[PDB]
Every structure is written in C-alpha cells, then in structure tokens.
Coordinates of N, CA, C and O in Angstrom, one line a residue:
X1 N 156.9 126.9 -19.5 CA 156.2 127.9 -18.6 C 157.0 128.2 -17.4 O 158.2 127.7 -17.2
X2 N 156.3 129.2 -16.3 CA 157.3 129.5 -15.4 C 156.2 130.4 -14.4 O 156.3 131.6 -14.3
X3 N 155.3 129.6 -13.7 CA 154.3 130.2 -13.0 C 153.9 131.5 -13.2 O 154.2 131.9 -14.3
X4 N 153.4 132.1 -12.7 CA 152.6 133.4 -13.3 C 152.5 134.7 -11.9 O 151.5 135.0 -11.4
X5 N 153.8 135.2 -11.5 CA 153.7 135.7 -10.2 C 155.1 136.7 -10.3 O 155.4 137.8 -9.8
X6 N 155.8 135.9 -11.1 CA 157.4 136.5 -11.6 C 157.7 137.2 -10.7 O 157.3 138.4 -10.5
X7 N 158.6 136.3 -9.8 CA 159.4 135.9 -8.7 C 160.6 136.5 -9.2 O 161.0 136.3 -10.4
X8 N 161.3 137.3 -8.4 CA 162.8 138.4 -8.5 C 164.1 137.9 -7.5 O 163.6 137.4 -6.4
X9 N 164.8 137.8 -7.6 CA 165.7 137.6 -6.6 C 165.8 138.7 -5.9 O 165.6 138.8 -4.7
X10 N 166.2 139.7 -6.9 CA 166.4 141.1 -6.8 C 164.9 141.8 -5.4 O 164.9 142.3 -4.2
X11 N 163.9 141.6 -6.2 CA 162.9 142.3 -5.5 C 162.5 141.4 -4.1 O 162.0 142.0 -3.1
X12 N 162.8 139.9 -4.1 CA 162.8 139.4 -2.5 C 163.7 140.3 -2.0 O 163.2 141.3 -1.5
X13 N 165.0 140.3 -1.9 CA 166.0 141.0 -0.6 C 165.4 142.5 -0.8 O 165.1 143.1 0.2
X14 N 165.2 143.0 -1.8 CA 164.8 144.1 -1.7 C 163.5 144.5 -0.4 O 163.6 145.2 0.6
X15 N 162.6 144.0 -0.8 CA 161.6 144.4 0.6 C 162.0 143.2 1.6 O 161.1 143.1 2.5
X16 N 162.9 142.4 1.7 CA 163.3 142.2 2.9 C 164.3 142.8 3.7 O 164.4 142.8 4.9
X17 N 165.5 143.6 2.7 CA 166.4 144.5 3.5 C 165.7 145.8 4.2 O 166.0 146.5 5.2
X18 N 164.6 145.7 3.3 CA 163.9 147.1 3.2 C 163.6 147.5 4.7 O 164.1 148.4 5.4
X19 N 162.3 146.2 5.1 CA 161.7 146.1 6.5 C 162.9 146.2 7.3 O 162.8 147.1 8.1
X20 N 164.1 145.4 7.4 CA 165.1 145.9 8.1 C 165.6 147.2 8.4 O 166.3 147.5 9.5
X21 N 165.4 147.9 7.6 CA 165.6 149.1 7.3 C 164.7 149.6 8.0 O 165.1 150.0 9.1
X22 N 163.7 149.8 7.8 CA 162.1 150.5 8.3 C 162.1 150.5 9.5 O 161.5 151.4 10.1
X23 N 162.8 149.3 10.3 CA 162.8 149.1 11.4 C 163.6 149.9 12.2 O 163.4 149.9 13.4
X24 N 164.7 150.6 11.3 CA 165.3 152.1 12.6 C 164.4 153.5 12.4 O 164.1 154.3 13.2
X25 N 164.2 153.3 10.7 CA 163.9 154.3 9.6 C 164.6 155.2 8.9 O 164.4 156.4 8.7
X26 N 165.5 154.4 8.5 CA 166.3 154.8 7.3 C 165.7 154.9 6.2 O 165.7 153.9 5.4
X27 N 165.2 156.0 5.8 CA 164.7 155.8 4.2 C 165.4 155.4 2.8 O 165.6 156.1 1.8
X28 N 165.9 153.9 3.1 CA 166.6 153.9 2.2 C 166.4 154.0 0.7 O 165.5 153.2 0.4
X29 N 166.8 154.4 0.0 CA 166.5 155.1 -1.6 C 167.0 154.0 -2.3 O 168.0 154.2 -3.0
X30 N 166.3 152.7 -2.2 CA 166.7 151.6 -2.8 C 165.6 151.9 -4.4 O 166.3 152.1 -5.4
X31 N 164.6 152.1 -4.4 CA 163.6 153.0 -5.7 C 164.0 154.2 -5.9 O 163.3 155.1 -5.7
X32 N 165.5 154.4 -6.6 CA 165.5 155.7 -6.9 C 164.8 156.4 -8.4 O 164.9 157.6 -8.9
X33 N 164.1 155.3 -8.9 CA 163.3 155.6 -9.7 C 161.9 155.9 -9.5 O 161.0 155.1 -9.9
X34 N 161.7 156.9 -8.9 CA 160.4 157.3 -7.6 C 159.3 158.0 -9.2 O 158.8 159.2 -9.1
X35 N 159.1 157.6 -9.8 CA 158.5 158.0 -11.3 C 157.1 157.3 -11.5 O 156.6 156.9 -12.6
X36 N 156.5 157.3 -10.5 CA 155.2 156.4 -10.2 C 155.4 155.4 -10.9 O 155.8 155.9 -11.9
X37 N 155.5 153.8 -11.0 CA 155.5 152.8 -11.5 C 154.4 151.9 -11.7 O 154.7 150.8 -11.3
X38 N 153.1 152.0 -12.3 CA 152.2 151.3 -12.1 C 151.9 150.4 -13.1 O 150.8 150.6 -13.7
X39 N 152.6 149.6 -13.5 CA 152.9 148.6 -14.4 C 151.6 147.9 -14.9 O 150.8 148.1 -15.9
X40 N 151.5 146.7 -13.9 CA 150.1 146.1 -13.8 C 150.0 146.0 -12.3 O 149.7 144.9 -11.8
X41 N 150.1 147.2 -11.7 CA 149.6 147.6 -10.6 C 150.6 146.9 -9.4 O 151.4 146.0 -9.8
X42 N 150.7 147.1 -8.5 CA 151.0 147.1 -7.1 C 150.6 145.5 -6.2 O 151.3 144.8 -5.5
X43 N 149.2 145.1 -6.6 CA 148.6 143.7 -6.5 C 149.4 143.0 -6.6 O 150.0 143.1 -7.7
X44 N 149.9 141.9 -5.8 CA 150.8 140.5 -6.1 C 150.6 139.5 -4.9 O 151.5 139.1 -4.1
X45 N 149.3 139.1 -4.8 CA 148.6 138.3 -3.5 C 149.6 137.6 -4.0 O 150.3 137.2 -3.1
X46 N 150.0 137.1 -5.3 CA 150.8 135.6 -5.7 C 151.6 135.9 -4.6 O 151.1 135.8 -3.4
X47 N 153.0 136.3 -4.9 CA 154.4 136.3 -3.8 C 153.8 137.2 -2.6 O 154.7 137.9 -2.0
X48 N 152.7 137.3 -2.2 CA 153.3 138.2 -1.1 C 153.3 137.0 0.2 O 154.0 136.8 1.3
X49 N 152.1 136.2 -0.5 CA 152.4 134.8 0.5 C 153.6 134.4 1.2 O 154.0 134.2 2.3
X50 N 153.8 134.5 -0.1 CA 155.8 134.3 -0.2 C 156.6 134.7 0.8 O 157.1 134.1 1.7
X51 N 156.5 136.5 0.4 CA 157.5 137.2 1.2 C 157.7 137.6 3.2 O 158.6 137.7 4.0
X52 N 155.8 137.7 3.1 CA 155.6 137.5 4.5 C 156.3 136.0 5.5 O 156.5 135.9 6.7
X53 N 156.5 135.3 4.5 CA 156.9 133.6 4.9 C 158.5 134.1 5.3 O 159.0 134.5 6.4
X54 N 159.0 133.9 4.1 CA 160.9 134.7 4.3 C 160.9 136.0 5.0 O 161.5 135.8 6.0
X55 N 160.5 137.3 5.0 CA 161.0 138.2 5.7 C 160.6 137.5 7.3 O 161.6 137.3 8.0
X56 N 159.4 137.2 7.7 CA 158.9 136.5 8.6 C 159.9 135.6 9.3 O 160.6 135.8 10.2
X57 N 159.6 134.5 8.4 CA 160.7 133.6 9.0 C 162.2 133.4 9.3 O 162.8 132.8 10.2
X58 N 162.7 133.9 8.2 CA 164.3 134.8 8.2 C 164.8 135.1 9.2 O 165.9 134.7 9.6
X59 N 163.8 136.0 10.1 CA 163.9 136.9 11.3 C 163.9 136.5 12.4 O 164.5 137.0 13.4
X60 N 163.0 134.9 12.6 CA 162.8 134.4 13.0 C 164.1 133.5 13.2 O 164.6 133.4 14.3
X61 N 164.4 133.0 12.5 CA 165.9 132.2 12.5 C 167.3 133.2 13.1 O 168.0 132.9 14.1
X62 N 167.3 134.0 12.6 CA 168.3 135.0 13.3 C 168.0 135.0 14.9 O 168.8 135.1 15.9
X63 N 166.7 134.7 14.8 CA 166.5 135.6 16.4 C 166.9 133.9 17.5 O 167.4 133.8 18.7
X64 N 166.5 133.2 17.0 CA 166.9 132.3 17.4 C 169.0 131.9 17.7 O 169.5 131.0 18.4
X65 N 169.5 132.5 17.1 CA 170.9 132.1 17.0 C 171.1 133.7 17.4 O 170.8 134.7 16.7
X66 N 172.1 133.9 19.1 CA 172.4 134.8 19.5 C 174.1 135.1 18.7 O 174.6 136.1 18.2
X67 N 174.7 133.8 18.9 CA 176.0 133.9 18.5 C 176.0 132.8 17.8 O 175.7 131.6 18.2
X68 N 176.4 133.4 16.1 CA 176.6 133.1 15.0 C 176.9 133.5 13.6 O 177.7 133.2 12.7
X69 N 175.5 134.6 13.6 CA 176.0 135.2 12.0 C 176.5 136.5 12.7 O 177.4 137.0 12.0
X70 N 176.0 137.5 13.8 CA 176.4 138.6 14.5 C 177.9 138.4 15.0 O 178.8 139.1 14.6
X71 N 178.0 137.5 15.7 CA 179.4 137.2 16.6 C 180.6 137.5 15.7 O 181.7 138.2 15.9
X72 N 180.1 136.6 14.5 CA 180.9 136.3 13.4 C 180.7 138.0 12.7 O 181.7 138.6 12.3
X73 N 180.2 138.3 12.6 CA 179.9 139.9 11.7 C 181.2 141.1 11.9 O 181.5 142.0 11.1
X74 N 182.0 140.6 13.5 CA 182.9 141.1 14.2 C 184.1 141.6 13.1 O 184.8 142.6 13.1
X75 N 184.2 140.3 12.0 CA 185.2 139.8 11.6 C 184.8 140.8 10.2 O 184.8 140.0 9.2
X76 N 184.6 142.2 9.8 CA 184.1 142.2 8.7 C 184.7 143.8 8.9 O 183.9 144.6 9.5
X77 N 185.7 144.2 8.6 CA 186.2 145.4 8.5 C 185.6 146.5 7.2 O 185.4 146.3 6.0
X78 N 185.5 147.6 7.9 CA 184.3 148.3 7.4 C 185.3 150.1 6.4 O 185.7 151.1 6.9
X79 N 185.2 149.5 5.2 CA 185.8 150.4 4.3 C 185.4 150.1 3.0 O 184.8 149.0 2.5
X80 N 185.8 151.4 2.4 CA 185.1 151.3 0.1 C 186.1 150.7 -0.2 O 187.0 151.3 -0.7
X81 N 186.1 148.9 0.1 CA 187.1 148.4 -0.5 C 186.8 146.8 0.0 O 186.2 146.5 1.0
X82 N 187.2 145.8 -0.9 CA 186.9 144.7 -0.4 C 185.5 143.6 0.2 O 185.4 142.4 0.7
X83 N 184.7 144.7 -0.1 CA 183.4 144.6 0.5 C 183.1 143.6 -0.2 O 182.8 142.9 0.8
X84 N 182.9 143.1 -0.9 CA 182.1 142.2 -2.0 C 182.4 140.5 -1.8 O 181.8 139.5 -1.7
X85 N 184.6 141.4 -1.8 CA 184.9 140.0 -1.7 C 184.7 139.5 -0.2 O 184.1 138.5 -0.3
X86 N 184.8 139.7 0.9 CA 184.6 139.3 2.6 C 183.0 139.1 2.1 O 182.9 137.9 2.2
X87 N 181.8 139.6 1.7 CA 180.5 139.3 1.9 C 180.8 137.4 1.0 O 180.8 136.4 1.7
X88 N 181.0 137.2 0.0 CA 181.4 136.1 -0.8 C 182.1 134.5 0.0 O 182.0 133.3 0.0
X89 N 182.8 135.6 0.7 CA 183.1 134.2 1.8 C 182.4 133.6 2.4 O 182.2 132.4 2.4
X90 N 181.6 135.0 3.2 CA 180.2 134.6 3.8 C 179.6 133.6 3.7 O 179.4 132.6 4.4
X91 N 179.1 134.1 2.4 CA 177.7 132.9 1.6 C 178.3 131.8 1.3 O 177.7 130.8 1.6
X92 N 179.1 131.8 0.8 CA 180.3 130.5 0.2 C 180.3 129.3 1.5 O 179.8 128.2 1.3
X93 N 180.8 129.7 2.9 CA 180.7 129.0 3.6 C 178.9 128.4 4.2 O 178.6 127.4 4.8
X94 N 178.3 129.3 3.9 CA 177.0 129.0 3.9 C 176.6 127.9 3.6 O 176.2 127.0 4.4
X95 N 176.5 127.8 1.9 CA 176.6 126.6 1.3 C 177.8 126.0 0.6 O 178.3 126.0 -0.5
X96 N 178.3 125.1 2.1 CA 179.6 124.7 1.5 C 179.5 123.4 0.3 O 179.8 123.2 -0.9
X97 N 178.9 122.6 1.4 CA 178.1 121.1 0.7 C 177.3 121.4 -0.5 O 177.5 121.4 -1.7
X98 N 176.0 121.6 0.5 CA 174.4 121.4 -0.2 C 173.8 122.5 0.5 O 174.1 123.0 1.6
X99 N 172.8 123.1 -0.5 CA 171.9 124.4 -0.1 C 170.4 123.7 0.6 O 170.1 122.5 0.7
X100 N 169.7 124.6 1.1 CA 168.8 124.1 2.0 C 167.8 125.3 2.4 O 168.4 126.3 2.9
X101 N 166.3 125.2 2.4 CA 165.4 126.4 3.0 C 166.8 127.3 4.3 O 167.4 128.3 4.3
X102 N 166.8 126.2 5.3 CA 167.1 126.7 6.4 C 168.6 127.5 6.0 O 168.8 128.6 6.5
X103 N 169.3 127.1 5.2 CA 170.6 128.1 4.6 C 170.3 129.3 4.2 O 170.6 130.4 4.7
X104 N 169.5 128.7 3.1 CA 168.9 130.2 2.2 C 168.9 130.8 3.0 O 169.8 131.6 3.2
X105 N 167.7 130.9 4.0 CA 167.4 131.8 5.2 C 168.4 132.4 6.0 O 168.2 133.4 6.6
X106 N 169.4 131.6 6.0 CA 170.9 132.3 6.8 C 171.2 133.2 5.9 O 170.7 134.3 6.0
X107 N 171.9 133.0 5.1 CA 172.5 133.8 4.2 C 171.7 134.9 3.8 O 172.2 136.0 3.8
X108 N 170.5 134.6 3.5 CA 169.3 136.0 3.5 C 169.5 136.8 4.9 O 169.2 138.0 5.0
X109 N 169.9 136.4 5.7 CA 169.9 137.5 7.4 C 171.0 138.0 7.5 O 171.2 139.1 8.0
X110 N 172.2 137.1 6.6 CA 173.7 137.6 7.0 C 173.7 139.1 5.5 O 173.9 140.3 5.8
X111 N 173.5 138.8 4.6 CA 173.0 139.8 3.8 C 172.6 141.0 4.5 O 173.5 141.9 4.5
X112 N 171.6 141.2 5.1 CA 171.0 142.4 5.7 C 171.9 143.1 7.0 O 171.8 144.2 7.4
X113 N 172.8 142.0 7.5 CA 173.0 141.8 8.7 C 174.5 143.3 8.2 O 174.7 144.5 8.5
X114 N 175.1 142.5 7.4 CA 176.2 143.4 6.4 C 175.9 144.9 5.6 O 176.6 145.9 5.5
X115 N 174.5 144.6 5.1 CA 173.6 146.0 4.5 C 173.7 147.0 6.2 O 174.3 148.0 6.3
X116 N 173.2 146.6 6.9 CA 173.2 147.7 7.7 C 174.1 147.8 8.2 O 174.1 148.9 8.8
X117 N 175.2 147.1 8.3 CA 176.5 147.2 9.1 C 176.9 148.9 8.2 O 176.9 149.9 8.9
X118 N 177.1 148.9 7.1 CA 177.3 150.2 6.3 C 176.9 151.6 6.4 O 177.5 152.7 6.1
X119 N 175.4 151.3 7.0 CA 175.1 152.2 7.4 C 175.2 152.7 9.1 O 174.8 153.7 9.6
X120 N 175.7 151.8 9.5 CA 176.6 152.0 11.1 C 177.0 153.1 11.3 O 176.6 154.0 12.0
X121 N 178.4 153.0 10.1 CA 179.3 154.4 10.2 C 178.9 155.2 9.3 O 178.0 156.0 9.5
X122 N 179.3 155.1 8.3 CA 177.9 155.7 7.0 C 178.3 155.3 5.6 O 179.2 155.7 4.8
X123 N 177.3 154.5 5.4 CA 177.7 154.0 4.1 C 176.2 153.3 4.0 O 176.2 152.1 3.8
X124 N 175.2 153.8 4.1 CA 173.7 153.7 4.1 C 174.1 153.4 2.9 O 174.7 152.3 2.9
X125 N 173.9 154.0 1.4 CA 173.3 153.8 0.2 C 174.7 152.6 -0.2 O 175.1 152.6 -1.3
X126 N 175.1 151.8 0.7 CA 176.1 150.3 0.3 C 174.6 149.3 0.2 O 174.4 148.3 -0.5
X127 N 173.9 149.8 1.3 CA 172.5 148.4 1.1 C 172.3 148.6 -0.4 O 171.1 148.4 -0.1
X128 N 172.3 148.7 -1.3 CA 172.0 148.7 -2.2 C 173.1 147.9 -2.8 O 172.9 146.7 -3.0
X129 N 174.4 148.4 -3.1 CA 175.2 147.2 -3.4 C 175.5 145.8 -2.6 O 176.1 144.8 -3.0
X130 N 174.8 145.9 -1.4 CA 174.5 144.5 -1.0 C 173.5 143.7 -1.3 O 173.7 142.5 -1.3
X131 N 172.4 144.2 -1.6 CA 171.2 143.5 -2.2 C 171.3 142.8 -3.5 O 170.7 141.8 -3.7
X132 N 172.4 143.6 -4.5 CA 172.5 143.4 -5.2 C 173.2 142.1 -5.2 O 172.7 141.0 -5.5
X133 N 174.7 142.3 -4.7 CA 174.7 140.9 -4.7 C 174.5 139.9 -4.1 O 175.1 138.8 -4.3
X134 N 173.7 140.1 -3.2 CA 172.6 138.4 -2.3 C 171.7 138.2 -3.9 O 171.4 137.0 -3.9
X135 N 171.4 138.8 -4.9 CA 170.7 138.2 -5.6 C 171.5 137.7 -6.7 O 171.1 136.8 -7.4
X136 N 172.5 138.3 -6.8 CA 173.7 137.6 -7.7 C 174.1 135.8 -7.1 O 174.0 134.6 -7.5
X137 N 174.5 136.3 -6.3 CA 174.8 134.7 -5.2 C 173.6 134.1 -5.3 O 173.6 133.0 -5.8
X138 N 172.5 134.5 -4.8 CA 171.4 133.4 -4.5 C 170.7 132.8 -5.7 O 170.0 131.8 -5.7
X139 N 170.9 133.7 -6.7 CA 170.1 133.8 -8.0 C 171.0 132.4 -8.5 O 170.6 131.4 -9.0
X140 N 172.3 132.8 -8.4 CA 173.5 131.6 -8.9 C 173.7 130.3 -8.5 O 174.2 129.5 -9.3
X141 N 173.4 130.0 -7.3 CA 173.2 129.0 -7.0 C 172.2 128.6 -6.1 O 172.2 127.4 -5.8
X142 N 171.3 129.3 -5.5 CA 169.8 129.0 -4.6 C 168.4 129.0 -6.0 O 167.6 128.0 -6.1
X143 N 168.4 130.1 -6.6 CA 167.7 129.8 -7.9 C 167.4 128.3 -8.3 O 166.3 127.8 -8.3
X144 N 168.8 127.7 -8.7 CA 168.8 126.4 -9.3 C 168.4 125.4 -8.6 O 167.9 124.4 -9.3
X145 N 168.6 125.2 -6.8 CA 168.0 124.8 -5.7 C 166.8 124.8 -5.7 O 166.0 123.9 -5.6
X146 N 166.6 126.0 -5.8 CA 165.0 126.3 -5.6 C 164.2 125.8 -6.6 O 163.3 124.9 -6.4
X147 N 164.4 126.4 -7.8 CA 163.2 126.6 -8.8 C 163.4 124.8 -9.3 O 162.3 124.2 -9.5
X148 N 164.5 124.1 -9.5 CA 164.4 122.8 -9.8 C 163.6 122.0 -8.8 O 162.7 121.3 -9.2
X149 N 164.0 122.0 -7.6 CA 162.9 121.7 -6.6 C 161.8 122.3 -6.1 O 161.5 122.4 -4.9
X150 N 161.1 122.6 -7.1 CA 159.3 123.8 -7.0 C 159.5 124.9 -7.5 O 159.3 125.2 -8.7
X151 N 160.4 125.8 -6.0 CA 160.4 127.4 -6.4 C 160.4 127.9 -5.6 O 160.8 127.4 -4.5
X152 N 159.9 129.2 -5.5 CA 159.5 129.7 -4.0 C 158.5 129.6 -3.0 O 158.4 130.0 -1.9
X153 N 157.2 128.6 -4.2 CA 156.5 128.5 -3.4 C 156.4 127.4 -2.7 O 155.7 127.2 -1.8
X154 N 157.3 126.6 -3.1 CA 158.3 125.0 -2.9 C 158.4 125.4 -0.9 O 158.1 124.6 0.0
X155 N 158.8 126.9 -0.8 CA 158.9 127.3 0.5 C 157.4 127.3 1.7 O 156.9 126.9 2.7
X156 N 157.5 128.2 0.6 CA 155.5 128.8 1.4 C 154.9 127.5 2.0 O 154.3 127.6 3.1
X157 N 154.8 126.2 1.2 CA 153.6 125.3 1.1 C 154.3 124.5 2.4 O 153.5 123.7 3.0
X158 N 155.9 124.7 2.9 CA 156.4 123.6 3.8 C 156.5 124.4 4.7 O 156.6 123.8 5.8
X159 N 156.4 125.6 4.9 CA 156.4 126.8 6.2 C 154.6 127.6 6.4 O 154.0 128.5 7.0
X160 N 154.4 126.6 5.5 CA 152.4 127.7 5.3 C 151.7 128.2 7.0 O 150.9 127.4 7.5
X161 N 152.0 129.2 7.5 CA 151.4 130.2 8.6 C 150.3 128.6 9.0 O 149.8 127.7 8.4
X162 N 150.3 128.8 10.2 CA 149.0 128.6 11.1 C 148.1 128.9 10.2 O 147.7 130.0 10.0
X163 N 147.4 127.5 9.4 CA 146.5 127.8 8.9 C 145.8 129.0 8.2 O 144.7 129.5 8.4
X164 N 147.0 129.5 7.1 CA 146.6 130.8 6.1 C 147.3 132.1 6.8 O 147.1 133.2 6.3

C-alpha cells in the first residue's frame, strides 16, 4: 500500500513555488492545462496539512538565514544555458553526507529562490523548468529519505502547528 492522499513531488514545489510567485503576482502559467480538471475534486484536507507545514515552514527557515542561500545565489549567472547544471550543484552540496527535514527545507527555498531569479530579467516561464527539476532531485534522493522513514507526513506529525 502507499497511504491514500497521493503525495507529488511535482505538485509540492508546484504550489509552493506558486505562493512565491503570488507574492509579487506573477501569474505564473505553471497549469497550462487550464481545461477545468475536476478529477475527484479539489478536496485534499489529507496533504494540505502537509503543504501549509513546508510552504509555511520553508519560508520560515529562509527567513531566518540572512546570508546563505541568497548571498550565495550571487554566484549563479543568468542565461538559456547551463541552468540545470549550476542548480545541481546547489542541491548536491545540500545533501552532501545525509539528508534531513531541515535540508529538504533548504533546498526547497534555494529552488524557488533560482525560479524567480529568471524571472528577474525575464525568463518567468524557466519556474517551470525549475520545479521540475526540484522534483527530479528531491524525488531521487529525498523521496527515499522520506517515504522510508514515514513520508510526508513523517514531517507534519514532528512540525504539527500549535496545536492543529
């Protein structure tokens, strides 16, 4: 089995780059399949637990570290070229050793941190090839972190909100 909430890699960074997004108001056209989708609905009390935890707390960790994943962001020359490989170093140094909630959570901020960098000068619709691969990477080796040790809710239950 495999809990009942079906958890995305893809769809975590997705509405977590998203809110980043929302927050200048870039409408980023990460759904360009805008075809009403009502599958089994919209409803997912399961993960949303979840997501409010990581977008939440994520943000929270960034905000706490003035100089670190920004400082360092300096270092990240901005052209249609190479992009993939400089984001890979990133995460790679992330988890050099051993992965960890509090990693994950970096690497989830340095993600977003590079999605919007793109859209700086203009290369808005790059958040989308960056999303993609935070879930490539994280799916590749945070997945197996994760889901062997719980999952995601492995997260929620050790970060659980002030009481709900």
């Amino acid at each position: 089995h495999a809990g009942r909430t079906g958890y995305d890699n893809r769809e975590i960074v997705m509405k977590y780059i998203h809110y980043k997004l929302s927050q200048r108001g870039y409408e980023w056209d990460a759904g360009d399949d805008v075809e009403e989708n009502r599958t089994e609905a919209p409803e997912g009390t399961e993960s949303e637990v979840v997501h409010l935890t990581l977008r939440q707390a994520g943000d929270d960790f960034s905000r706490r570290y003035r100089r670190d994943f920004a400082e360092m962001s300096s270092q990240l020359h901005l052209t249609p070229f190479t992009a993939r490989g400089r984001f890979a170093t990133v995460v790679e140094e992330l988890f050099r050793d051993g992965v960890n909630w509090g990693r994950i959570v970096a690497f989830f901020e340095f993600g977003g941190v590079m999605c919007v960098e793109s859209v700086n000068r203009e290369m808005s619709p790059l958040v989308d090839n960056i999303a993609l691969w935070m879930t490539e990477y994280l799916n590749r080796h945070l997945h197996t972190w994760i889901q062997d040790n719980g999952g995601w809710d492995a997260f929620v239950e050790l970060y659980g909100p002030s009481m709900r």
